[PDB]
């Protein structure tokens, strides 16, 4: 049970880090366009 539960916790952390990665990718393209 504690293992299936840990995997939930890691899956959730991975998903939330994916959101953060799409936010930094966004931020970079905006700076890129402004720089152009």
């Amino acid at each position: 049970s504690g293992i299936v539960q840990q995997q939930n916790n890691l899956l959730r952390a991975i998903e939330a880090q994916q959101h953060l990665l799409q936010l930094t990718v966004w931020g970079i393209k905006q700076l890129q366009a402004r720089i152009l």
Binding site: G2, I3, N9, L10, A13, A16, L20, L23, Q30
Partner: protein
């Protein structure tokens, strides 16, 4: 950029929350192997 900042902070707290919880679970799981 103001919305960007805000969604960063929201997801950063979620993540921090999730990592603490996984450190606690990691400890329990290591104990319960014994």
């Amino acid at each position: 950029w103001m919305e960007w900042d805000r969604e960063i902070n929201n997801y950063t707290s979620l993540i921090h929350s999730l990592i603490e919880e996984a450190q606690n679970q990691q400890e329990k799981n290591e104990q319960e192997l014994l």
